[PDB]
Design a protein around this nucleic acid. Structure first.
Ligand SMILES: OC[C@H]1O[C@H](O[C@H]2[C@H](O)[C@@H](O)[C@@H](O)O[C@@H]2CO)[C@H](O)[C@@H](O)[C@@H]1O
Ligand SMILES: OC[C@H]1O[C@H](O[C@H]2[C@H](O)[C@@H](O)[C@@H](O)O[C@@H]2CO)[C@H](O)[C@@H](O)[C@@H]1O
Lengths: 437, 437
DNA sequence: TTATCACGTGATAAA
DNA sequence: TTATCACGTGATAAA
């Protein structure tokens, strides 16, 4: 898709309140005539850097702030320049999450953190430590239930356990993140992931469990605990499960440290609708009535708008979310974040399946998370170099074929030409190419 | 995942009644103690041939019959051997759809065909031809609505229009399909796709429209028509849209010819649960109460079970489905079907976007749909041949380097060794490798 | 059918 | 950093 003047197309993840955001777009259209289409395509955070490099893509893209710095480095986002009065409507730290190289690159919407979700009926007293989960599962298995199921395919859900005992992504020193200092391979990281793998080896968890599998098992009352964000609450509300949201369990006496995301909206740098997107975001979405329509669909978490967050903060589920977010850290937005997430995703999946041990999976993840992505020109230098190496050799064999009179067969590879050249220079070449004078 | 003795894991597409099928699995577990997990992973029809080749994968896989012959050729499915009395409970033609090389390779469940779905309130008199859709869109656009939106990303939804004027997939002659005779590049195929592209060029349809985009626009009353199967009816029931299901529009005075699918269940050839899967499928799912629980979730279409289909056939939506299925054809199940679907998917997307003209997109699709997939041994013959070609050359240069005394530099590519060999034989080599005596 | 060379990125390493 | 050779499949074609 290409965006056109006069219409607004929005991308937002399929687990967010896209139907509520479409209501906000319908009110926008009612007051300005600008149609607003909300879409939730799969892997949007991956498709956007591909399509936006040539002017394609949506007008607005919704994602956690950790992806936007990579978008900004590639020149895909329009600089966000809201009035000082509007910046004051949002919490400063939410603005910090969308500041890259001194510039605001997106509008912050909501603060998201994973928490522990548990079935009050099956488990009135949720556990406080990770270590007492294997025993808890033994009790529930005798009843036909399981202790805990959560998404093992995305390292977002596993990172709180990895980070508890000291595992970290990029070290922050003296005002900046050091991208060569990755801490996914330390003792704290190995201890957390080994406990995860140990849960699978002892049949307390399934390596293939994914989002929908874990969501269904909890919402059907088959498992007593899940780990998820505020977006998942509305599906449990409609189910018959009476649930609570509380602090994540400790590991080795240390709190789980979830990576905190700030759902943000960036404007495509190629959109002839920048003013309309700025108007819709500032005056329609980032208002009480606008965030309410989205929040009633799928809860947003702790919204960046002060006026509406003073209402939402009364929800004890939001207070638990903040409790977990205080125990965690706001994610970096640096372009390296995507390479960090891929490497950890592979490390968690490979160790949970048994394809790799914990030590080997994390050692390679540390190398990958710090691997410098080669520039386009570097790739091009290599391609041209090998193209030139072949062209020189091709010319040589072209000259030997046309001028050697080498008593060649009708069809032969250039190796047979090279062999003929060797005997002419006084060499002996055997069949496997062994050569001597 | 690997399957284990005593439990049943099922894969079914995410647009089908997986929650209803889970109810059937829960009743199974109640009467036998065998837990049954229903999962709907993305692209299951693609993951199954990958994971099942090494013993992984689910116990049972649900898909339209067109994929199963390729699974059977790869040896991934257990032969289905139901008693004669049970075969008689299902319509013979549904059994034919799952017969490959004389053997039954799956249990048939339901017959699916696309129909025309329309909003009765916005459009009480649905159109009968494709040709009158562009004018109909002009009327609805002035009201703020659109005429027709359907999935343009999957060629299943576009094939009825391609096949109307004479386009076909594989020709059937003398009792068999000829896999070298592909008819996606004839005048009938070009005419149907050109009309599709013409709908996009004249702004009546969007090239990027996908399933969820089309489903939402119809279920929100923004478009007057969509093309979908019976699985989509329950989402429109919960919406406020008053809809009807009728025959697909004609093109060039000829009926649209949808490819008819038979939702089938195959048993993994690597499952130590074959008897349990056979028991669950025959005595729990393929019963009235079992198909009812699934059908109440997402409608199945015209079920293969005679006793329950005599009930469902009274539904006028099912009668329209059958009306369309009679105008279409049962899909082949031959292994080439997957290569046919990929080629047409690329042809439709490339022409709808403008990356390729209709003529070029269909010409390449015909070549691809008939392209013989090279055997593993053929791939291996090529790999070894090039490995051997490099090994011979490597030895030669190894001998020249160690015995030439060629006045070489410290580091040089093998091209510089070859150059030195040329002057020793009496040649002149320039820098670009131009050589002569 | 088999065959040759192209092709761009990977594995490895000198510096 | 740049450098070399490996690597398996693609483009092309003789037969
Ligand atoms: O798992 C890697 C993934 O983690 C985070 O993604 C979250 C997202 O922030 C949430 O809003 C929600 O959608 O769950 C996602 C995990 O599936 C990072 O934001 C993302 O960049 C990263 O790839
Ligand atoms: O579009 C190619 C696709 O068409 C059919 O898939 C259908 C399927 O049969 C229906 O049950 C439903 O899920 O919609 C699908 C299209 O998205 C073929 O069965 C399938 O093999 C083919 O790839």
């Amino acid at each position: 898709m290409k965006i056109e003047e006069g219409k607004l197309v929005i991308w937002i993840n399929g687990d967010k309140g896209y139907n509520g955001l479409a209501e906000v777009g319908k009110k926008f259209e009612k007051d300005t005539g600008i149609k607003v289409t909300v879409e939730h395509p799969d892997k949007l955070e991956e498709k956007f850097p591909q399509v936006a490099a040539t002017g394609d893509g949506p007008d607005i893209i919704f994602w956690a702030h950790d992806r936007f710095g990579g978008y900004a480095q590639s020149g895909l986002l329009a600089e966000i320049t809201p009035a000082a009065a509007f910046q004051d409507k949002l919490y400063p730290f939410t603005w910090d999450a969308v500041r890259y190289n001194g510039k605001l690159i997106a509008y912050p919407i909501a603060v998201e953190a994973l928490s522990l979700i548990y079935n009050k009926d099956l488990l009135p007293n949720p556990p406080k430590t990770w270590e007492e989960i294997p025993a808890l599962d033994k009790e529930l298995k005798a009843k036909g239930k399981s202790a805990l199921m959560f998404n093992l395919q995305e390292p977002y859900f596993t990172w709180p356990l990895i980070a508890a005992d000291g595992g970290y992504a990029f070290k922050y020193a003296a005002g900046k993140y050091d991208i060569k200092d990755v801490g996914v391979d330390n003792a704290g990281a190995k201890a957390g992931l080994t406990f995860l793998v140990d849960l699978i080896k002892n049949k307390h968890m399934n390596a293939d469990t994914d989002y929908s599998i874990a969501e269904a098992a909890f919402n059907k009352g088959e498992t007593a605990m899940t780990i998820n964000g505020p977006w998942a609450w509305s599906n449990i509300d409609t189910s018959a499960v009476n649930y609570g949201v509380t602090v994540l369990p400790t590991f080795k006496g240390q709190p789980s440290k979830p990576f905190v995301g700030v759902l943000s909206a960036g404007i495509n740098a190629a959109s002839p609708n920048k003013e309309l997107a700025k108007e819709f975001l500032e005056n329609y979405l980032l208002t009480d009535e606008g965030l309410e329509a989205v929040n009633k669909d799928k809860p947003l978490g702790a919204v960046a708008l002060k006026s509406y967050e003073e209402e939402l903060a009364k929800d004890p589920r939001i207070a638990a979310t903040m409790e977990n977010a205080q125990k965690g850290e706001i994610m970096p937005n640096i372009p390296q974040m995507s390479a960090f997430w891929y490497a950890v995703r592979t490390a968690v999946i490979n160790a949970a399946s048994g394809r790799q041990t914990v030590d080997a999976a994390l050692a390679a993840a540390q190398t990958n998370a710090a691997r410098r992505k080669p520039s386009w020109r570097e790739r091009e230098n290599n391609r041209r170099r090998e193209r030139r190496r072949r062209a020189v050799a091709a010319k040589i064999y072209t000259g030997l074929r046309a001028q050697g009179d080498y008593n060649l067969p009708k069809h032969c590879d250039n190796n047979e030409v090279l062999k003929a050249l060797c005997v002419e220079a006084g060499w002996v070449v055997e069949e496997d190419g062994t050569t001597y004078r």
